[PDB]
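Input (lysozyme):
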Amino acid sequence: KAFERCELARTLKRLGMDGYRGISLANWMCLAKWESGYNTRATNYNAGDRSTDYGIFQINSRYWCNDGKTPGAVNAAHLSCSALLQDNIADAVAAAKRVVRDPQGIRAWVAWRNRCQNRDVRQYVQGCGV
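Output:
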């Protein structure tokens, strides 16, 4: 499913993402935009370490979800990577919350540092009614 900007912002709000671990809704929106273009079926294979990023938040198979084919794979969030390819984002949200419980927080995603950190991200939620 490819989400429309405001539709996604309200859905994240409803799932308790606004301010989770000090992270504003605007920042999660900035992250989803750059990671997947708000697309839940987005997958990215990393040839180098043989891991794959899955879903709207591009969650990595080496540490957070299990796909069976990732070398040296671990499971912190404990889900099947398949759960992160659904139209319903509840599991993807549960996984993203787990990722930011680590001290790095939202900095865990390099794309967040490149295009979201220390920038005005209001544009991602303006006019959405959140």
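Strands lie at 43-46, 51-54, 59-60, 65-66, 79-80.
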